[PDB]
Amino acid sequence: PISPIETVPVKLKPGMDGPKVKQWPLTEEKIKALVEICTEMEKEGKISKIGPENPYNTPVFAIKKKKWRKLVDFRELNKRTQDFWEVQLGIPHPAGLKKKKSVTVLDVGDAYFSVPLDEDFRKYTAFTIPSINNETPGIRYQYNVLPQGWKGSPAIFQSSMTKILEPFAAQNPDIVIYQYMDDLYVGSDLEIGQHRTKIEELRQHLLRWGLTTPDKKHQKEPPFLWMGYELHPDKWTVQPIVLPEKDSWTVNDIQKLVGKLNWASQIYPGIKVRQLSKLLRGTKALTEVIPLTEEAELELAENREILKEPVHGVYYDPSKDLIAEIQKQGQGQWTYQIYQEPFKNLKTGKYARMRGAHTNDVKQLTEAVQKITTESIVIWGKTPKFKLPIQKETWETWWTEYWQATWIPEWEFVNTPPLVKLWYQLEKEPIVGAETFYVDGAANRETKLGKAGYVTNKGRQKVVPLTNTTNQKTELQAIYLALQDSGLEVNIVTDSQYALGIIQAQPDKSESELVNQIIEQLIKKEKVYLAWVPAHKGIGGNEQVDKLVSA
Amino acid sequence: PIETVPVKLKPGMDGPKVKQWPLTEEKIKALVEICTEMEKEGKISKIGPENPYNTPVFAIKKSTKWRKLVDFRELNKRTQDFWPHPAGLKKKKSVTVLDVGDAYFSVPLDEDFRKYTAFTIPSINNETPGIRYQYNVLPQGWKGSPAIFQSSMTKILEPFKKQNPDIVIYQYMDDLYVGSDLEIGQHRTKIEELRQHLLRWGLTTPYELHPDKWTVQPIVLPEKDSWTVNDIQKLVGKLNWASQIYPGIKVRQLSKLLRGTKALTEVIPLTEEAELELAENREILKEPVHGVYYDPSKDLIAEIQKQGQGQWTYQIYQEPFKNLKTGKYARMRGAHTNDVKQLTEAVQKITTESIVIWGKTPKFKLPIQKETWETWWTEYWQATWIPEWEFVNTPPLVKLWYQ
Numbered sequence: 001p002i003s004p005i006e007t008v009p010v011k012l013k014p015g016m017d018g019p020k021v022k023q024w025p026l027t028e029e030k031i032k033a034l035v036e037i038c039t040e041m042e043k044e045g046k047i048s049k050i051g052p053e054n055p056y057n058t059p060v061f062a063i064k065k066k067k068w069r070k071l072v073d074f075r076e077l078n079k080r081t082q083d084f085w086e087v088q089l090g091i092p093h094p095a096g097l098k099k100k101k102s103v104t105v106l107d108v109g110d111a112y113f114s115v116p117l118d119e120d121f122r123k124y125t126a127f128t129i130p131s132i133n134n135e136t137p138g139i140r141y142q143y144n145v146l147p148q149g150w151k152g153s154p155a156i157f158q159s160s161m162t163k164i165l166e167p168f169a170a171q172n173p174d175i176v177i178y179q180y181m182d183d184l185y186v187g188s189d190l191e192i193g194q195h196r197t198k199i200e201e202l203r204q205h206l207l208r209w210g211l212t213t214p215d216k217k218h219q220k221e222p223p224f225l226w227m228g229y230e231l232h233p234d235k236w237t238v239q240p241i242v243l244p245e246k247d248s249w250t251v252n253d254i255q256k257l258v259g260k261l262n263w264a265s266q267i268y269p270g271i272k273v274r275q276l277s278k279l280l281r282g283t284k285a286l287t288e289v290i291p292l293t294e295e296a297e298l299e300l301a302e303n304r305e306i307l308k309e310p311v312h313g314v315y316y317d318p319s320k321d322l323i324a325e326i327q328k329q330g331q332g333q334w335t336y337q338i339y340q341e342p343f344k345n346l347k348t349g350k351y352a353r354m355r356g357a358h359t360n361d362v363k364q365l366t367e368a369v370q371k372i373t374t375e376s377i378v379i380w381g382k383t384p385k386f387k388l389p390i391q392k393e394t395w396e397t398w399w400t401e402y403w404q405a406t407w408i409p410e411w412e413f414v415n416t417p418p419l420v421k422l423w424y425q426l427e428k429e430p431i432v433g434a435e436t437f438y439v440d441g442a443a444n445r446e447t448k449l450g451k452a453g454y455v456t457n458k459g460r461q462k463v464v465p466l467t468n469t470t471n472q473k474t475e476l477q478a479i480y481l482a483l484q485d486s487g488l489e490v491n492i493v494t495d496s497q498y499a500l501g502i503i504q505a506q507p508d509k510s511e512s513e514l515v516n517q518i519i520e521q522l523i524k525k526e527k528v529y530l531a532w533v534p535a536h537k538g539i540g541g542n543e544q545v546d547k548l549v550s551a
Numbered sequence: 552p553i554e555t556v557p558v559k560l561k562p563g564m565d566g567p568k569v570k571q572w573p574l575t576e577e578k579i580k581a582l583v584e585i586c587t588e589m590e591k592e593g594k595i596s597k598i599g600p601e602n603p604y605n606t607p608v609f610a611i612k613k614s615t616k617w618r619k620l621v622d623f624r625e626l627n628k629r630t631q632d633f634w635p636h637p638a639g640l641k642k643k644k645s646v647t648v649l650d651v652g653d654a655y656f657s658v659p660l661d662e663d664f665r666k667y668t669a670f671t672i673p674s675i676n677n678e679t680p681g682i683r684y685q686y687n688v689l690p691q692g693w694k695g696s697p698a699i700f701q702s703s704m705t706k707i708l709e710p711f712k713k714q715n716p717d718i719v720i721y722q723y724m725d726d727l728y729v730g731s732d733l734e735i736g737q738h739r740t741k742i743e744e745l746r747q748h749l750l751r752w753g754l755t756t757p758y759e760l761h762p763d764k765w766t767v768q769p770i771v772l773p774e775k776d777s778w779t780v781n782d783i784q785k786l787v788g789k790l791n792w793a794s795q796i797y798p799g800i801k802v803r804q805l806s807k808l809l810r811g812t813k814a815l816t817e818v819i820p821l822t823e824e825a826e827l828e829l830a831e832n833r834e835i836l837k838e839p840v841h842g843v844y845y846d847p848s849k850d851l852i853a854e855i856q857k858q859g860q861g862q863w864t865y866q867i868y869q870e871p872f873k874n875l876k877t878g879k880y881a882r883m884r885g886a887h888t889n890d891v892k893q894l895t896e897a898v899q900k901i902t903t904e905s906i907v908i909w910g911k912t913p914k915f916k917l918p919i920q921k922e923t924w925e926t927w928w929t930e931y932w933q934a935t936w937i938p939e940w941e942f943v944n945t946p947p948l949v950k951l952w953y954q
C-alpha cells in the first residue's frame with residue numbers, strides 16, 4: 001500500500017537541474033524482469049508511465065543475487081537534490097534500555113515505497129526500460145513514492161513514520177516505541193495477553209496508513225541479532241568476536257583488528273589496544289605490512305585470553321543509582337565499569353590516550369572521568385557516582401597545583417591497589433645545604449653533535465659529549481646529568497624554557513626514554529628544586545656553564 | 552508587528568549546520584517545557600526533514616526558573632549583514648546593564664530566513680531523533696534582532712534621552728548599558744525611571760559596574776627583607792621579561808650581585824647601586840606603555856592564567872606584548888567556587904569589560920581541557936551572549952610574571 005500522508009516538499013540545490021544520464025542497454029532477460037516488475041509496481045501506483053516531455057533519466061538494472069529485483073542508480077540525482085536533516089546516525093546503546101516485560105520487533109515491509117513522493121519533484125525520477133535492440137522507444141516511468149537509494153528517502157520516510165505513530169502513542173502512553181530504519185521495536189509491561197492485543201491494534205493502525213507488518217507467527221523472537229549485539233530478555237552482550245591468526249599483518253588487517261577490540265571493550269573488561277594502535281602510527285597504504293612488536297604480541301595475546309570467557313551486560317533501571325569504577329591497567333592504560341548493582345555491569349570501557357608526549361597518572365585518571373561523564377550523559381542522560389582508587393590528599397594537591405582548570409566530581413575513595421599516587425613532588429622553595437648545580441647543554445644544528453655539562457657551587461664541573469642530538473635534547477640531558485651526580489637533595493638551575501616546562505609538569509610516564517630516565521632519578525631524589533634564569537644575561541653560575549659548554 | 556524586514560545571508564553562504572551537544576535528562580525536560588509554550592505563543596514552529604540547518608541549544612538559569620540559551624555564534628558569522636561606539640561609557644562613574652531582549656519576540660522574522668534558525672532538542676541515548684523547531688519571531692541571541700529592532704528602540708528612548716542629556720546609553724545584543732556620573736542613589740533612581748518608561752511602553756525587563764576603577768595592573772616587584780640568589784634570579788628573570796615592553800629597565804647592577812657560582816639559598820645583600828637600580832625599575836613600571844592603540848578592524852584576544860587560591864589573571868590584546876587591558880579577578884571560595892565556576896565567572900567579567908570599552912567580545916584562549924568545558928560551562932553561565940573560544944596550555948613562566 002501507499003500512504004495518505006502528506007508529502008514533504010523537495011527542491012534541487014539552487015541552479016541545478018535534473019539528471020540526464022543515458023540508459024545502458026541490457027539483456028532481453030533483464031528487460032523482461034523489469035517490464036513485469038514495472039507493471040506490478042505500476043498497478044500499485046508506486047510509479048507511472050510518463051509522456052515524452054520528461055527530459056530526465058537515471059539508469060536502471062535487473063539482477064538476482066544467487067527471485068528477481070530492480071535496482072536504480074541515483075548517483076547523479078542524489079548529487080543534485082537538496083540536503084536533508086541528517087537521519088539518525090547513532091543508534092542507542094543496549095546499556096541505556098529499561099528492562100521491559102514484553103517486547104516485539106516489527107519490520108516495515110516495503111517501507112520507502114509506502115510513502116508518497118512530493119509531486120513537483122517526481123519529474124526528476126524518470127527512468128527507462130530499454131526496448132530490445134533499440135528497435136522501438138523504451139518505456140518511460142517515474143516514481144510516485146520514495147525511491148530506494150534516493151537521498152531523501154531515509155529522512156522523509158522516518159519523518160512520515162513519526163507522524164503516523166503520533167496519534168497511536170497519544171492513546172497509549174504505557175507503550176514504548178523505538179523506530180530505527182525500517183524497523184520498530186515495541187515493548188510494554190502490560191500482560192503478555194493484552195500486550196499481544198496492543199501489538200495487534202498498532203499493526204492495524206499502520207495498515208490503515210499503508211504500512212504492512214509481520215504477524216505473531218512471523219515476528220522475530222529473542223535473542224535479537226541487532227547491530228552486532230545480542231539482546232536477551234534479561235541481559236545483553238556483543239556478538240562473538242573472532243580475531244584472525246596470521247603470520248603477516250597489513251595496515252588493513254590491524255585496522256580491522258583494533259576495531260573488533262574496540263567493539264568488545266564495551267562489555268569485556270580489560271581490553272587494551274594501545275601497542276596495537278601504535279603500529280598504525282605509520283598511517284600509510286593499507287596493504288603495507290607492519291612487523292608486529294613484542295608489546296603488540298603480548299597485548300593481543302592478553303586480549304585473546306579475555307575473549308575466551310563470555311560476558312553479558314544488564315539493562316537500565318532509572319530508580320537505582322548509577323556508579324562508575326576505574327582501574328589502572330598499565331602505563332597509560334585504564335579500564336572502567338558502570339553498574340547499578342555490584343556485579344551486574346551496564347557496560348565497560350577503556351581509556352589510554354596520552355594527549356601529548358608526557359603525562360602523569362592523576363591527569364590521566366581525571367581525563368578518564370571526563371570520558372565516563374560524557375558517555376553517561378549520552379546513554380542515560382545523567383552523570384554517575386565515581387568510586388576511585390585515589391585519595392583526597394593526592395587529588396586535592398594535584399588540582400590545586402595544576403595550572404589548568406579542572407572539575408572534580410564528588411567521589412568515594414576505594415582502596416584497591418594499584419592506588420593512584422603522585423610518584424613525586426618538586427620543591428616550592430630552594431634547598432639549603434644542597435649543592436646548587438648550574439646545568440646547560442647544546443648541539444650543533446648542523447652536525448647534530450652536542451655536550452651537556454654542569455658547574456656547581458661546590459666547585460665541581462663536568463661535560464659529557466653527545467652525538468646526534470638537538471639543543472632541546474641536550475638541555476634535558478644537562479638536567480639528567482645533575483641528577484645522576486647529586487646527593488639526595490639537589491638544586492638545579494637551567495636557562496632552557498623548553499626543559500623547564502617539561503619538568504614542572506611532573507610527568508610519571510613519557511615517550512622519550514630520556515624523560516623516563518629523568519623520572520627514575522626524580523623518584524629516588526628526596527628533595528629536588530629547579531629554577532630558571534634568562535639565558536646569556538651574565539647572571540652567575542649560568543654564565544659559567546654557558547662558557548664551559550661553549551668551549 | 553506586520554512589517555518583516557528581509558534578511559539575507561552573506562553571498563555564497565549556506566546556513567549553520569552545527570551539531571547539538573547531548574544534555575542531561577533534567578536539561579532536556581526544561582527545554583521541552585520551554586518550547587511547548589513557545590509553540591503555543593506561536594514564536595517557534597515544528598520543522599520537517601527538508602530543513603538541514605541546525606544551531607545548538609542549552610538550558611541555563613540566569614532560581615528554579617530554567618531558561619533557554621541559543622548558540623547563534625555560527626549564524627551570526629554568516630548573516631553579518633548590517634545597516635561610533637560610545638567612547639564615554641567606560642569613563643562614566645556608574646553603568647547598569649538591563650535585559651531588554653523579551654522585546655524582540657513582539658516582532659516577526661522574515662519568512663524566508665526562518666529555516667536558518669532551526670534547532671533540535673536532543674533525546675537521551677538516541678531513543679528518538681530530536682524535536683526540531685524553527686523560529687517565527689526575532690530570536691534572542693541573533694545579531695539580526697538588535698539591528699531590526701533598532702528603530703523601535705530609538706523611538707522608545709527618545710523621551711528619556713531628551714530628559715537626561717548626559718546619560719549614556721549603548722546597546723550590545725540583548726542588553727542596554729546605561730551610564731551616569733551621578734551619585735549612586737540618584738543613579739539607581741534614574742535607572743528605575745527608564746525601567747518604568749520601558750515597561751509602560753510594553754517592553755518587559757527583569758548588575759551595575761563602575762568603569763571608573765578599571766585600570767591596567769602595572770608590574771609589581773617584591774619587597775623582601777633578605778634577598779637570596781634565587782630571589783635575585785627571579786627578580787632579574789621577571790625584570791628581564793618586563794623589558795620587551797618598558798625600555799628603561801636595567802639589570803647590570805642587580806646581576807653584578809650574583810657574579811660567582813653561588814648556592815641558591817645563599818643570602819645576597821642588596822648593595823646600593825643594585826638597590827638604586829631596582830628602585831628606578833619600580834618607577835619605570837609605574838608609567839604606562841607608549842604606542843598601544845586599539846585597531847577596530849582586528850580581533851581582541853584574551854588570555855587567562857590560573858593563579859591558585861581563587862586568583863585569575865587576564866590580558867586583553869590584539870598583538871602580542873601590546874596589551875590593551877590587564878587585570879586580575881579574585882573569588883571568595885564560597886564553599887565551592889570550583890575552578891570551572893571561577894573561570895566561567897571570570898570569562899564573563901572580561902567580556903563585559905570588553906563590551907563596555909570597545910563594544911565587542913574578545914576571543915578567549917582558555918586554560919582548560921576542551922571536553923571539560925563543553926560539559927560544564929552551562930552550569931554557571933548567566934549572560935545571554937557567548938564569545939568565541941579555544942583551549943590552550945598555559946606556559947608556567949607567565950603565571951608568575953603576571954602574579
Ligand SMILES: C=CC(=O)N(C)CCOc1ccccc1Oc1cccc2cc(C#N)ccc12
Pocket residue numbers: 092097098099100101102103104105176177178185186187188224225226231232233234315
Ligand atoms: C525483554 C528484553 C528487553 O528488556 N529489551 C530488549 C530492552 C527493552 O527495551 C525496549 C523498550 C521498548 C521497545 C523495545 C525495546 O527493546 C529494544 C530496544 C532497542 C532496540 C531493539 C532492537 C530489537 C531488534 N531486533 C529488539 C528490541 C529492541
Ligand SMILES: [Mg+2]
Pocket residue numbers: 440441495535546
Ligand atoms: Mg645556553
Ligand SMILES: [Mg+2]
Pocket residue numbers: 570571572605606607608669670671672
Ligand atoms: Mg540543536
